Ligand binder design. Structure first.
Ligand SMILES: [Cl-]
Ligand SMILES: [Cl-]
Ligand SMILES: [Cl-]
Ligand SMILES: [Cl-]
Ligand SMILES: [Cl-]
Ligand SMILES: [Cl-]
Length: 715
């Protein structure tokens, strides 16, 4: 007794019809009647072959309340049949989650009608659609009238055998490109290829358009997405009797993972940013868990949030990456073993995981993107130290050593594929004086412009160097001193006892970072170097590969001391108090390869609108076509925030590319490291570590205007 569901990886959509799940014809996936409710099941195949489920129910604007209730019931009971491991989403028309919208990049059509009105999914047609949206394109069915028209939008007059695409004079070219997807969708999916699509603009309306609409009058402009200030703060509550009562458990993110308890379920309030999460404990009694959706709705009312607020319901052990990022260092029991983690985001579920191999890196942009390496780091490079307001060439014998009282500029030529490119690294010491740091940024930008405005520009801060920057010095480790200086003047002497953290990247290169000499700075994944007046300790953590201890050894040579190698837990006590005694220090191993699972890359459009900084998430798989030439985009790799600069965006947004990327970082509710590197990228000159993230990158994509292409490519 059932309906054929669960199945294999794919997408299944039902329309809730008189308390019954009714399959939508697959060629109409994306069409929704505003008067009905739907249930949607996305099945994702994990890398280990297992199946992971996302259950969404979708409420139309004019949808019922009992019908909405049925959709809520079916979402709950389908999850019951899937043994409670799906994550549930309540999606309202016009404010659906990014995860939901990624299932349809032909757009969404919102149809007039519903079950009660007596309408089905199944030609004699006469509809009109208003198409709004850049990243998330939505086609709202509107009254067939000239009064529905706005000159800032594009409209689709559907006449069955003929489809008329009408684009207002005040509509930007990118919006017209997204509107062609809807017109093609109606042609290829509703009429299955047999329909003409006719494109036109203001003043070139065909006789058919004017025969149903009448003569065209003057038309008004259009009136109808994440302010950055609302992203940051969130709170965590514990529910009781979902007589619904909640108690504040944490008032400021990041939250302690220990705050979550298995016997209860919690609400993570992010409502000022438009979403709340319901985290179900695995030992919460089933009355509470089956009533999670009502508990979330009651919370929306109790806090006067908009009823369109996105609601997510997560089972314990299956929390999404966006949920876990609200927590200080979320660590699973499953973490270091296995193939993935609790969740695998739909938009990367089909990304082949390429291990690093320097010999073949020049042939795989995928490897470049996934490891943050544009090449093996063996090309021509000039290094400058900023003294006053000028670039001063650094002694080549000292290449790889960097002093915290300086800021440097690295010009590097990278080769990947059969193409050469340049990267300008702007390293800023944590103790470099503000004027020279600010001078290094200006001279960096100046160096870019004199080199054609084409080189990659990557702002780096001491202690958080990108993986590619470490690998620039042969087999020698990048050595990073705490607040010295290497200029001709004050060649000042070192401290008595120094400490050095020696970390390696996936390419084998290392960096030796001087840190405060205490036990709390130690780390079991890395080798360490402790130099005292007396001797020299070479400490090796239990997770330290041989590639780290070799790099730590070449550092003990430039320090001119012979080591005494000391394994973690096998420490002589002269070592133990040279730090001031023993204390706790980080031992949980790093994500290494699961970073992409725990922090998948995300694409955003940003904008410095008059007064407020706004970011819009780009849902679905990352596509080159999503990069509008008149936009400044952000590709949030975890270790590094790319900022792609469209060639046709305003000069204001172009020069603000650096700070807009940092306003994005500092407002991130994960409380991202403020030292996180930023990497400005120019349109048409993107590095492999950027393009390798994209399905189908065309090296000649922008040679022809994408809109001129689209009207040609069948329209
Ligand atoms: Cl059954
Ligand atoms: Cl069923
Ligand atoms: Cl949205
Ligand atoms: Cl990888
Ligand atoms: Cl290139
Ligand atoms: Cl990093």
């Amino acid at each position: 007794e059932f309906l054929k569901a669960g199945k294999e990886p794919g997408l299944q959509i039902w329309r809730v019809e008189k308390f019954d799940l009714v399959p939508v014809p697959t060629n109409l996936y994306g069409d929704f009647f505003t008067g009905d409710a739907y249930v949607i099941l996305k099945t994702v195949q994990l890398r280990n072959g297992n199946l992971q489920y996302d259950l969404h129910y979708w409420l139309g604007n004019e949808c019922s309340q009992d019908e909405s209730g049925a959709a809520a019931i079916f979402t709950v009971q389908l999850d019951d049949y899937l043994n409670g491991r799906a994550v549930q989403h309540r999606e309202v028309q016009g404010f659906e989650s990014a995860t939901f919208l990624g299932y349809f990049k032909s757009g969404l059509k919102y149809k007039k009608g519903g079950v009660a009105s007596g309408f089905k999914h199944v030609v004699v047609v006469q509809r009109l659609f208003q198409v709004k949206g850049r990243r998330v394109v939505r086609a709202t069915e509107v009254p067939v009238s000239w009064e529905s028209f706005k000159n800032g939008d594009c409209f689709i007059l559907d006449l069955g055998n003929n489809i008329h695409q009408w684009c207002g004079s005040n509509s930007n070219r990118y919006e017209r490109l997204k509107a062609t997807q809807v017109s093609k969708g109606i042609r290829d999916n509703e009429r299955s290829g047999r329909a003409r699509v006719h494109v036109s603009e203001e003043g070139t309306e065909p006789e058919a358009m004017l025969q149903v609409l009448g003569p065209k009058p003057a038309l008004p402009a259009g009136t109808e997405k994440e302010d950055a200030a609302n992203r940051k703060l969130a709170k965590l509550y514990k529910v009781s009797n979902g007589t619904m009562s909640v108690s504040l458990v944490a008032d400021e993110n990041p939250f302690a993972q220990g705050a979550l308890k298995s016997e209860d379920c919690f609400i993570l309030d992010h409502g000022k940013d438009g979403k709340i999460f319901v985290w179900k404990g695995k030992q919460a009694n089933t009355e509470e868990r089956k009533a999670a959706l009502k508990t979330a709705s009651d919370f929306i009312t109790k806090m006067d949030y908009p009823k369109q607020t996105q609601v997510s319901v997560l089972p314990e052990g299956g929390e999404t990456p966006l949920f876990k990022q609200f927590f200080k260092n979320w660590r699973d029991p499953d973490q270091t073993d296995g193939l993935g983690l609790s969740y695998l985001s739909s938009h990367i579920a089909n990304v082949e995981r390429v291990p690093f191999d320097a010999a073949t890196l020049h042939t795989s942009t995928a490897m470049a993107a996934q490891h943050g390496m544009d090449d093996d780091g063996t090309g021509q490079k000039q290094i400058w130290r900023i003294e006053g307001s000028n670039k001063v060439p650094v002694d080549p014998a000292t290449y790889g050593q960097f002093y915290g009282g300086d800021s440097y500029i690295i010009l590097y030529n990278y080769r990947h594929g059969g193409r050469q490119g340049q990267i300008i690294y702007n390293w800023q010491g944590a103790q470099s004086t503000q004027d020279e740091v600010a001078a290094s940024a200006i001279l960096t930008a100046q160096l870019d412009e004199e080199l054609g405005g084409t080189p990659v520009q990557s702002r780096v801060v001491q202690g958080k160097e990108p993986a590619h920057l470490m690998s620039l010095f042969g087999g020698k480790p990048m050595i990073i001193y705490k607040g010295g200086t290497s200029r001709e003047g004050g060649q000042t002497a070192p401290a008595s006892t120094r400490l050095f953290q020696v970390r390696a990247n996936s390419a084998g290169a290392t960096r030796a970072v001087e840190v405060l000499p205490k036990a709390g700075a130690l780390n079991s994944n890395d080798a360490f170097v402790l130099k005292t007046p007396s001797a020299a300790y070479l400490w090796v953590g239990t997770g330290a590969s041989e590639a780290e201890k070799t790099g730590a050894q070449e550092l003990l040579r430039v320090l001119r001391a012979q080591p005494v190698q000391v394994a973690e837990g096998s420490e002589p006590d002269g070592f133990w108090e040279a730090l001031g005694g023993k204390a706790a220090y980080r031992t949980s191993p790093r994500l290494k390869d699961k970073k992409m699972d725990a922090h998948p890359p995300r694409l955003f459009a940003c904008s410095n609108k008059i007064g407020r900084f706004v970011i819009e998430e780009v849902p679905g798989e990352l596509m080159q076509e999503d990069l509008a030439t008149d936009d400044v985009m952000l590709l949030d790799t975890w270790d590094q925030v790319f900022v792609w600069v469209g060639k046709d965006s305003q000069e204001e947004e172009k020069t603000e590319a650096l700070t807009s990327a940092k306003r994005y970082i500092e407002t991130d509710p994960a409380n991202r490291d403020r030292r996180t590197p930023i990497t400005v990228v120019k349109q048409g000159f993107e590095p492999p570590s950027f393009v390798g993230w994209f399905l189908g990158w065309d090296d000649d994509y922008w040679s022809v205007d994408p809109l001129d292409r689209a009207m040609a490519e069948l329209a």
